[PDB]
Paper text:
Mechanistically, local distortion augmentation, translation/rotational register shift and partial opening of the nucleosome are employed by AAG to cope with substrate sites in fully exposed, occluded and completely buried positions, respectively.
Different from the previous DI-containing NCPs, the DI in the AAG–NCP–55AP is in a completely buried position with low solution accessibility. Similarly, cryo-EM analysis revealed two major conformational populations for the AAG–NCP–55 sample. One is the structure of NCP–55I determined at 2.8 Å, and the other is an unusual NCP structure at 2.9 Å resolution, with the terminal nucleosomal DNA highly flexible, unresolved in the map (from SHL-5 to the proximal end). In this unusual structure, however, density of AAG could not be found. As for deeply embedded positions (e.g., –55 in our study), local DNA distortion and limited register shift are insufficient to fully expose the buried base.
Residue numbers in the entry:
A (entry chain E): 43 to 134
B (entry chain A): 38 to 133
C (entry chain H), D (entry chain D): 30 to 121
E (entry chain G): 11 to 118
F (entry chain C): 14 to 117
G (entry chain F): 23 to 102
H (entry chain B): 21 to 102
Amino acid sequence: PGTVALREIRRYQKSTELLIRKLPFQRLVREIAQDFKTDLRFQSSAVMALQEASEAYLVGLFEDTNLCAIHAKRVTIMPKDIQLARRIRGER
Amino acid sequence: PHRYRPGTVALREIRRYQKSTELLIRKLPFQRLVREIAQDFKTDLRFQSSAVMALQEASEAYLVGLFEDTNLCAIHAKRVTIMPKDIQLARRIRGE
Amino acid sequence: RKESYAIYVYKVLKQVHPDTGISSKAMSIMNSFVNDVFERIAGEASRLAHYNKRSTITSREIQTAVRLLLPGELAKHAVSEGTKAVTKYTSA
Amino acid sequence: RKESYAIYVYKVLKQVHPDTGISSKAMSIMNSFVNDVFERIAGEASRLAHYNKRSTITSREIQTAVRLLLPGELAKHAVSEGTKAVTKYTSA
Amino acid sequence: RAKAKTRSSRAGLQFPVGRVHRLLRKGNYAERVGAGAPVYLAAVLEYLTAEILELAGNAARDNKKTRIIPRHLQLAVRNDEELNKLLGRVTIAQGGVLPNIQSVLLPK
Amino acid sequence: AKTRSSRAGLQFPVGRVHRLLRKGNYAERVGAGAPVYLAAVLEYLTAEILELAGNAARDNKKTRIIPRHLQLAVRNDEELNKLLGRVTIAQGGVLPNIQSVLLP
Amino acid sequence: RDNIQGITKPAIRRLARRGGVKRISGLIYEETRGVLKVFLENVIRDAVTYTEHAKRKTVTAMDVVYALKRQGRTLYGFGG
Amino acid sequence: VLRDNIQGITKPAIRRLARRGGVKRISGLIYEETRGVLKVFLENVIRDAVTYTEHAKRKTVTAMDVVYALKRQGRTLYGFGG
DNA sequence: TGCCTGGAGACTAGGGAGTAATCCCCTTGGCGGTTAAAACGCGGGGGACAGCGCGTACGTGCGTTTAAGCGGTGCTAGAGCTGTCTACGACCAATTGAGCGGCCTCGGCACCGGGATTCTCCA
DNA sequence: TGGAGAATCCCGGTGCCGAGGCCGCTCAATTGGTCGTAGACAGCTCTAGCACCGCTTAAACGCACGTACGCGCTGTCCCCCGCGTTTTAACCGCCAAGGGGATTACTCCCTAGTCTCCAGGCA
């Protein structure tokens, strides 16, 4: 257990393709945006920009989370690593 | 004789230096440090006293916030002693 | 010579707390606060005038710059007295 | 009729890499990079003119903004190129 | 000429509408500045100043003091969530910190 | 009728940068050396990025500059990383990097 | 309603293996979904404000780029 | 010529700064790391302050130069003007 | 590759800055007392760290489901451009009054010192 | 649980320097009118956003199982905390020289403004 995980690490870091599916993310954007206005409309490039930004944000957060996990002498990331990284970066 | 347990005096200094607002670095050695750092950029330089006080307030606030993040990193590793890897991790996550 | 928001902050303080004074350093920090928030709102209204290819800053741009900068309840209340002052200026 | 820095990135790329092409998304990234660097240097030079009570932007404000924003060797070679271009422009 | 009424008086404001208008015109923010923009901006500046001055007076009264010092401004800004979020990258001179000790350092 | 960009040895347009500086609400007046200097700095930074992007495309055996090559060019140089630290490049990804204790 | 579950557990694992994470707890996924929802709410609220100022009913890509740009999250490749 | 004034940032001063930051126990290797961090921060701020001084053709670094150098790095300081 | 539109040449005007003289704020350097703070030393206690065991919770592989995605059709909201006009903001002259600099008083608060009330640690 | 010592807090007296109020005056906000243009409004086009269907297939999901890994416990020994004493240099007050920031007046030039046309630039 870990050779397929490290193979997935060496596979996904090299590529630039988006890891979240298109339509569930678009549904999530239209669900979140509905609280601010009713009957909003979205360009497709707007949803693609939101997907690129969200994926880059989550990957940078997981990099800092992994740094916290190695700091606590662990290989498994936990929610306390995420909230510590968000606390230090100023989001929490 | 009477001696306190290790940590009682440290908590007393924590409460004392969190209740107060004074600068915690002596003004003359910080002024001399500012002079030797500024002479590597431009020689024959002069400084207003308000500039050195602004530098000291900024530097002390930066170090206090860094020590808060360092303490969070040390408690994350289930410790009470801050170590240089805590400073390194806080500055790495901050992006410095 | 020099100008500052020293008297207006004192008038606001005596409106709010009639028994409470203010020192010189606290007044200087309040002056820095007012100048900083002025620069933030004016710079955002400048960018919003530039985004819409407009050459005028109006109360609409100041309102949406207040909505962009200030957090939620602060933004709602700041829009409330901004619209109140503009309505009292136009009507009276 | 959109304006873009695309043909000038073509010219600079042909000046440095004759047998290399570029995609549309990479050209969009280069155009956004050019516009972001332009607005950074222009904003810092505008602030430098405002601080020093000057109503004009000369090559000195652009020099100081370039020295403030870019890191070390990039700033040194950038001010070298800018000084060379200004001297050659005044020579012609 | 009639009696001169200031632009702050007819807007019901204490902050100067005309000074804000001059600083907007001379700030190179736009080619044109409208009439309601300085009224709106002076109202917002007065509201934010009054919000800090309420909590700073409360902090000064909690310390049994009359005059507001920078420490009370620090306590007022950091003890209110919206104002701490607005001034998150701001250092108050002679402000200090909130008294905050972690639970794992307190002895059991 | 000679353009000011050819008189400065620059490929970037001096006149377009001057027009953008005039109507950008940066100052009331613009000096004559400011668009020349700004076009030179922008041309230098574009040339540096295109240099490292072409090197990344050549080392990875391709003839086209893609956003992955721009990503590798920006995040591999230290000072370009310091210039573009808070900037995301679309369809660029991240570097291949693994923590040293995770390796077998 | 409840489209945060469309951010699936293998998608969160793909984002973690891109970040270099080798082992992942089972409580990571709900934390990641909440963090993504907070980030999306902030950026989308800013972009909807930018759309409201233009008297427009369509969120363009420019609104998303300026919304990301205000928070220090500048994005290239769309018109930044 | 000034030399080795970073040792004037003493160990009890760093201890006081850590006590303000809520630190209860301090390792003995903290002080050299903290001195290096303080030197890096001061070099970064003072370089832009000196640049702002040199643009004005002045020889004295005023309080405005320090406040603008801190404001350019996202570290706005209230109380010294601006 | 043809139209188009913004850049270039060139003339004028006047204000933005350059420079020289002046004047005085305030920076730097110095001396001496004093005394607070840093530095050094040392005992001990408690916390960092290595080792071990266990119990469980992720990783992984396989079979089943599900809905993402690609292609295709179709409808219409609304982005986007153009034309017209009009109200709104820059601008200018005159006026005048609010704010700023300076001067003066007095009281909020820092300091000091003694006494009552927690508070920590060891029997 | 209790007592010695330490530490914290509370209350009265004293002065001091900075908040705050008053006066002059000046320069910047206000008032009234003029003029051009930015923006609001009306209308039309056609791009593109959205709704829906069919399939087919990669991908999500459920589960079974084993082992790597988190986590609790324990020992130990290093290293940092608390305190006492000594040395060092920070700090306060004074005492000037003078260096350079700030102001003012006059002078040059160069950048805004405008007409025309032509060569880059884009679709």
